[PDB]
Design a protein around this ligand. Structure first.
Ligand code: MTE
Ligand code: MTE
Ligand code: MOM
Ligand code: MOM
Lengths: 373, 373
């Protein structure tokens, strides 16, 4: 009776942590090999079966201020609104969960360093769609924009998330209703025919397979806006957790990881090129990446690849690399850490950020290797 | 021949690290005793002699888009523009420098935990003054607003700093040209008759004793915008430093400190109330403060005093407190650490953020005490 029979096929080289629903990340060897992650490798994160969508009978629902409903077809979304492109990294709340479970087991998909990818998205500006539906530039008080997807659970409830009205209306926030990804139409796994893209914020809020946009006095009433995607003290456990006591994750903290070489690898002597990525929420730029060969006692500054984005609008990761000298038969512990435009930094160790749900894993990334003789 | 004879007198209980120029902080016992720091205790940071200002012949200079100059008197600044009030914490770039020098000596004023204070500022909105001078809401490209103060060095050069045009024009950024502080007129030490207040950013940019506001394609050409107030890798030293390689500090990272009890104090048994402060740049709210009694192996969540500010506009610190049980003749290492609305956190230790200039000290704050028998 398989609810997943309809799912699309995937690239055979992904690291799959869950088949049903499908949740996988690119192999770390390939993760930072390009600045734009090819579509078929882009990390994929699904809560439910992937909806089968028939393009022409597709209608996106958008309720105007007055409770009247406007309803947009896919053709009309492409032609009513000037297409805008935005290059943005999506990062799973629980990227790097693995390292947290090493300290104490947590419940969640066991992502490694790869629950993150970058793509050039293209489509309508949400701000434009809303203005078109009749909304003003500014509402009085705290308002939220709610998205529902087409995928729902056994019992009817759709996946949903929300963002602050302000962020939705802002030209600089670049919030897209994308129908293109890396120059082609949105793949099924990635939200075909339409998804929201919220630059600078946790991946959880980029609703895929979009069916509705509502404006409201409150956050998305949904399970995943309300009872998931929050960070707690390392002391909080499954009996003590109170979801009303922490804000829903929106922006993410500064983050980086070593993608080459891999743990346990033996590398040749002379010169070693260490490569990785770094990124920060909030559209805040990565301004420096320090790398260590000795477990974080001494550091050197890595080189940042990529082109500078406007101030406040660094939605894309920075890729870094650092070529250094390595001795016959030494042991290296390779550490990296990133600093952003607000000078936020990454913490030394993992225990003090541990949280029962395994999200927000951004302590320094350590990689043990040896040098052959 | 004393260039400082003219300086105002101070409160006799301040912790002075430099008499000439005057640079002092409130005693830590008093630092967090109120939410608004009384004027006479507010940390004071001067590069130069304090200018003697004659109110009525005071003119603030403001150059309109066209290179023509408008020139505002103090009366006119009070009456042309609707007074707006903003409660904001100013924090020295080098707050908590002390802890950094403990690792390796640095050059700078040796601030302890107190180079920070909060006050309700009142005065003209910079955005309004600029619009009045003729500027538009939005300029094409990256533009900067430059401030000069009345205080200059032996050889003519005034203290100066700048902020992004965007931040200056934004209603939400609350950038004030203040003439009031905690309900009275600006004290001399604190900028009388006018100072800039930039919420959410390092104290360095709140030019006191304001004489000019210029709009420009570039940052403030001044020594302190260009060759100071930047963060470097812990590897960079006095011979290797390149000031063109890091951004000028604007927003600050998440920060907290224990203000009570004090290092080396012996406290009574039974119950101990630990009090402190926490704050974050960017108008990002402090959402949690964990406190440890055992040097940071186990944590408990402190209570946050204060009232929630609008989203994105938490310019004021949060004060926290936590009452816990303490045993006869134990040793405590009290640690605190804060997490903000973007979920940025504070790093475990200081060595890995060390920088040749001692700025950006935000590793966990440790406080050793004993419990009497
Ligand atoms: N409809 C729908 N949209 C969704 C999800 C989902 O399960 N259903 N998952 C969200 C989460 S938690 C993440 S991290 C991103 C993953 O985006 P990607 O699958 O394109 O990498 O999708 C977001 N949008
Ligand atoms: N004219 C002038 N303005 C100035 C300074 C200065 O030396 N001269 N110091 C700046 C710095 S570095 C700081 S931290 C703040 C201190 O503000 P406070 O002295 O009111 O606490 O003033 C800022 N504005
Ligand atoms: O679960 Mo989505 O934030 O990876
Ligand atoms: O030097 Mo001012 O940032 O304390």
């Amino acid at each position: 009776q398989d609810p997943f029979a309809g799912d699309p096929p995937r690239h055979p080289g992904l690291r799959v942590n869950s088949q049903k629903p499908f949740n996988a990340e690119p192999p770390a060897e390939l993760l930072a090999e390009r600045f734009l992650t090819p579509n078929e490798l882009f990390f994929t994160r699904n809560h439910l079966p992937v909806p089968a969508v028939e393009p022409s009978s597709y209608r996106l629902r958008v309720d105007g201020p007055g409770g009247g409903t406007l309803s947009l077809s896919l053709a009309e979304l492409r032609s009513r609104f000037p297409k805008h492109e935005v290059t943005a990294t999506l990062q799973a709340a629980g990227n790097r969960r693995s390292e947290m479970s090493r300290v104490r087991p947590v419940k969640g998909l066991p992502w490694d360093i790869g629950a993150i990818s970058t793509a050039r998205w293209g489509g309508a500006r949400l701000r434009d769609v809303l203005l078109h539906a009749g909304f003003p530039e500014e509402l009085q008080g705290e308002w939220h924009v709610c998205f529902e997807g087409l995928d729902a659970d056994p019992g009817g409830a759709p996946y949903g998330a929300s963002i602050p009205y302000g962020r939705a209306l802002s030209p600089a926030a670049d919030v897209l209703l994308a129908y293109e990804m890396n120059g082609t139409e949105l793949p099924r796994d990635h939200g075909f025919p339409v998804r929201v893209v919220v630059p600078g914020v946790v991946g959880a809020r980029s609703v895929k397979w979009l069916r509705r946009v509502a404006v409201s006095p409150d956050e998305s009433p949904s399970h995943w806006q309300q009872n998931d995607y929050k960070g707690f003290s390392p002391c909080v456990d499954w009996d003590t957790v109170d979801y009303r006591t922490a804000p829903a994750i929106q922006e993410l903290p500064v983050q980086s990881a070593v993608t080459q070489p891999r743990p346990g690898a033996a590398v040749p002597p002379g010169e070693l090129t260490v490569k990785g990525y770094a990124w920060s929420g909030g559209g805040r730029e990565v301004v420096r990446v320090d790398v260590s060969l000795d477990g974080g006692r001494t550091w050197k500054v890595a080189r940042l690849m990529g082109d500078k984005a406007p101030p406040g609008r660094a939605w894309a990761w920075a890729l870094w690399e650092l070529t250094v000298p390595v001795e016959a038969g030494t042991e290296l512990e390779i550490v990296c850490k990133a600093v952003d435009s607000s000078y936020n930094v990454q913490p030394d160790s993992v225990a003090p950020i541990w949280n029962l749900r395994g999200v927000l894993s951004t302590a320094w990334h350590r990689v043990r290797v040896s040098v052959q003789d």
